């Protein structure tokens, strides 16, 4: 199946370049054009240029020409954007989108990457176990989870059993503390009645900060 | 530029329910060799990437259910669900991709559904953390409708204020609710000094407060 | 204009 498979988070300082990179799987990335778009906020949208993977050649937004920079590595069927000297205004999930020719929607788009533009430098969060118990019960279901504290920039991904435990989890907004650091909370909710034979482990990443935790979450 | 204009920003309606919403340009977004209305519609569901509706105003893409369609010329564009399932939710977007692409800012659709209470748990902080030296509380509201709730936070009965953070999910795609996280942060020397920790929840689904507690060290 | 720039880069 088609894929457009974009790099991790990132975070950099005012002033300095990133490269992110956008790589095509399931299909012939020259056949397809590829757009790179800009998403601000969950309400905004704004495209920075296209790439014809197949030429090299680039077409950009005015209010991008000179800021980003369209490049292709054909053999290992991957995009690159640069953007340069980057304001906090830059701080937005890039992603990039193919397009079969000119008449044509943005048909499949990557998942995005994150960059944080920021004199802030990054912190890495504490896991903690939310432990199931007496308190967090509800007719034959217990909640449990994982707190996520005091990290920066956002975001931070969490699985529950390395993805093969998806139905019933919450894993939320972050919340901005007064320290400008982050936090959240991840939690699902079970059978109270397999606690003892079920093992539930949080995969917690937070890649600006080589954060990389399992922390198993045991009744107590 | 091209400017797009979507209205209305948000709107909310039950599953089963049509909805219209609207995507004006600033001029006129035909092309001209082929005729074709350079519109795009999109789909971004909650933590998802935009999916590709509808083309040329009026086109399906492969792939999307038949009851969503696009329709207008000139400058009025028109995206109709003709019968909203709850997975419908999403911002929905309109692209002209005659000149230097532009979007409009997107209309919100959110599902109503019945009132349903939420489900309420709480987390004394895990011994790790207090090795360290703070104390965080968590109050989980779980899967309840509609999202106004309040917590209030009570440590031997008295009202905390001040020390609490709280955050509410995106509406869920399946059963239309929300949840609800708050932690209450205390250091640990306080956090010892007390031994009923409560969070009292309000929600239109509970004819009172519902609290939770634990007493520390038990 | 702009709308050029996309026929010629498209073609």
Known sequence: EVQLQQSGPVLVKPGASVRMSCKASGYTITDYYLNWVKQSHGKSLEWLGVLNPYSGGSLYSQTFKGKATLTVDRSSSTAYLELNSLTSEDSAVYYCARQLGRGNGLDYWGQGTSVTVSSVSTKGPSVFPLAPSSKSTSGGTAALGCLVKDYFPEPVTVSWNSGALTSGVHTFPAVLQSSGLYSLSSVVTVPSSSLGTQTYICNVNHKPSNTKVDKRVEPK | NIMMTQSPSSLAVSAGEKVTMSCKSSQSVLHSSDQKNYLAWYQQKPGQSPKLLIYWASTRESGVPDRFTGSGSGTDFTLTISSVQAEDLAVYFCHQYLSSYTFGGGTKLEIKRTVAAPSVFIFPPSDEQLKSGTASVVCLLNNFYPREAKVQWKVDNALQSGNSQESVTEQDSKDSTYSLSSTLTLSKADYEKHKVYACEVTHQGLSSPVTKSFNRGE | ?11
């Open chain 3, 1 to 11: 204009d702009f709308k050029d720039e996309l026929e010629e880069f498209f073609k």
